[PDB]
Design an enzyme around this catalytic site. Structure first.
Site, mmCIF file in Angstrom:
data_model
loop_
_atom_site.group_PDB
_atom_site.id
_atom_site.type_symbol
_atom_site.label_atom_id
_atom_site.label_comp_id
_atom_site.label_asym_id
_atom_site.label_seq_id
_atom_site.Cartn_x
_atom_site.Cartn_y
_atom_site.Cartn_z
ATOM 1 N N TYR A 67 16.354 38.557 24.036
ATOM 2 C CA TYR A 67 17.686 38.193 23.522
ATOM 3 C C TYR A 67 17.664 37.477 22.158
ATOM 4 O O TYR A 67 18.715 37.097 21.671
ATOM 5 C CB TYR A 67 18.374 37.231 24.492
ATOM 6 C CG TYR A 67 18.600 37.798 25.864
ATOM 7 C CD1 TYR A 67 19.691 38.616 26.114
ATOM 8 C CD2 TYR A 67 17.696 37.594 26.885
ATOM 9 C CE1 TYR A 67 19.921 39.149 27.371
ATOM 10 C CE2 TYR A 67 17.913 38.128 28.155
ATOM 11 C CZ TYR A 67 19.041 38.910 28.399
ATOM 12 O OH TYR A 67 19.226 39.403 29.656
ATOM 13 N N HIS A 93 27.212 43.245 25.459
ATOM 14 C CA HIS A 93 25.825 42.972 25.871
ATOM 15 C C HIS A 93 24.956 42.771 24.634
ATOM 16 O O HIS A 93 25.068 43.571 23.648
ATOM 17 C CB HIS A 93 25.244 44.094 26.753
ATOM 18 C CG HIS A 93 26.117 44.339 27.928
ATOM 19 N ND1 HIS A 93 26.213 43.414 28.992
ATOM 20 C CD2 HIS A 93 27.070 45.269 28.143
ATOM 21 C CE1 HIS A 93 27.137 43.836 29.826
ATOM 22 N NE2 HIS A 93 27.688 44.976 29.333
ATOM 23 N N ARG A 143 14.790 30.566 25.966
ATOM 24 C CA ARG A 143 14.032 31.359 26.943
ATOM 25 C C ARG A 143 14.145 32.851 26.594
ATOM 26 O O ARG A 143 15.093 33.274 25.956
ATOM 27 C CB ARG A 143 14.558 31.166 28.374
ATOM 28 C CG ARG A 143 14.838 29.731 28.801
ATOM 29 C CD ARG A 143 13.599 28.844 28.733
ATOM 30 N NE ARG A 143 12.402 29.442 29.347
ATOM 31 C CZ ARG A 143 11.143 29.198 28.972
ATOM 32 N NH1 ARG A 143 10.876 28.402 27.928
ATOM 33 N NH2 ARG A 143 10.158 29.771 29.647
ATOM 34 N N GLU A 180 33.938 44.330 26.346
ATOM 35 C CA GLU A 180 32.634 43.988 26.975
ATOM 36 C C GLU A 180 31.525 43.963 25.931
ATOM 37 O O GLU A 180 31.381 44.900 25.134
ATOM 38 C CB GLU A 180 32.343 44.986 28.102
ATOM 39 C CG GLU A 180 31.087 44.690 28.906
ATOM 40 C CD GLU A 180 30.999 45.448 30.226
ATOM 41 O OE1 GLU A 180 32.005 45.487 30.961
ATOM 42 O OE2 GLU A 180 29.861 45.898 30.599
ATOM 43 N N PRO A 184 26.425 34.132 33.867
ATOM 44 C CA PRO A 184 25.299 33.326 34.297
ATOM 45 C C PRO A 184 24.107 33.492 33.358
ATOM 46 O O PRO A 184 23.899 34.554 32.737
ATOM 47 C CB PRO A 184 25.010 33.794 35.723
ATOM 48 C CG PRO A 184 25.561 35.199 35.721
ATOM 49 C CD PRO A 184 26.824 35.115 34.892
ATOM 50 N N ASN A 185 23.394 32.379 33.160
ATOM 51 C CA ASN A 185 22.121 32.345 32.455
ATOM 52 C C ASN A 185 22.252 32.410 30.918
ATOM 53 O O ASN A 185 21.268 32.094 30.224
ATOM 54 C CB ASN A 185 21.163 33.411 32.992
ATOM 55 C CG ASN A 185 20.906 33.341 34.482
ATOM 56 O OD1 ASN A 185 20.330 32.355 34.979
ATOM 57 N ND2 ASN A 185 21.273 34.412 35.219
#
Lengths: 144, 144, 144
Positions: free
Chosen positions: A24, A103, A19, A101, A11-12
């Site tokens: 990020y 991030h 944004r 994974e 999500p997002n």
């Protein structure tokens, strides 16, 4: 294609770049998809990039990978990293697909809740706080 | 319209009034939507009332508000208040839309889990335990 | 039909039997549905078996049970057992439908997070670690 990879963003993450630039970075979701696509093309890897805000749609997409010859999954679950035991169980259910994974941000420098990953224990590696190049680093782990 | 507002109600709040009358009162979801609509009409505010049981559909609706000239959001996330970091991150991603959190019941008088709001830190105000009139109080905060 | 029952299975339980055989056994989701169906037929109980990976679709299905003459619900929420306060609140909203919670595995022998059930407090009974026959045991509690 020597290898078929699925990249899932949660999500997002479709709002990358436009944004929260200070968290990020300045590069957008279209940039990320095209960067992945072009890298994989250069290595003779077949890739699909998938994003959804829906927890259930992410699970459905993981289940479909069991039947379509997927070899590896790169996943950034977004905020679902911190609480979705349903996505953790979906990843565990495809035990012969390698998983990394990712991030984008340095989650250990942010709110306390972002330190928790309920998905990491069923994956085969994790890349944190390397920005968008973390996705390329993940593909290379899968391709090694 | 001097101002355009989106009101989001989360899971189960479509069952207002017909169920759990001792916790959330005797007035139903149709009453709430019409009360909002009519109030906003009297103040020359354009309003849309939206409800879903789906976490991902709420996020999608928040993202759409970035592109359609929404000025403010009133949100009652329902049970998602207590755990949806994905809805928190969706609200944070629209940093120039003002946001007010609303709870109908006095959540501090109920189960311990209802004391937690993961969404409140990214909003611009919160109204708790004022019943359905809390939504009017939220619109007035946005319109001030 | 002296009684109408809805059986809900949550995320990942469509992968019964084909995956994680050492945790949930060798029998698959099709076996479970047919076993339920045939048992209920033998007792003159009308039954529907429903599965989804989507939290919001499970809530929608619970709400529909309020309007279609459902008497009882058997529910295995899967991983949502451990965190979905939205599914708990959906079950609470249908206060005159009897509910039994089922878990296939012995959750008390697994990861610590599986010990938590946010749904059990609003149900009328729970069956844990009896394998697929736990669903038959639940139907008999409803039919007694």
């Amino acid at each position: 294609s020597h290898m078929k990879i699925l990249v899932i963003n949660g999500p997002n993450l479709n709002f990358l770049g436009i944004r929260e630039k200070n968290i990020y970075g300045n590069e957008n979701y279209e940039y990320l998809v095209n960067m992945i696509n072009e890298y994989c093309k250069s290595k003779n890897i077949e890739v699909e990039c998938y994003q959804s805000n829906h927890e259930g749609a992410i699970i459905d997409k993981i289940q479909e990978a069991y039947f379509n010859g997927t070899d590896g999954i790169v996943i950034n679950p977004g905020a679902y990293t911190h609480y979705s035991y349903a996505i953790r169980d979906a990843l565990a259910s495809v035990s012969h697909i390698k998983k990394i994974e990712v991030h984008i941000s340095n989650v250990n420098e942010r709110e306390e809740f972002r330190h928790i990953s309920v998905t990491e224990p069923v994956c085969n590696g994790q890349i944190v706080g390397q920005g968008l190049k973390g996705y390329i680093m993940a593909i290379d782990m899968l391709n090694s």
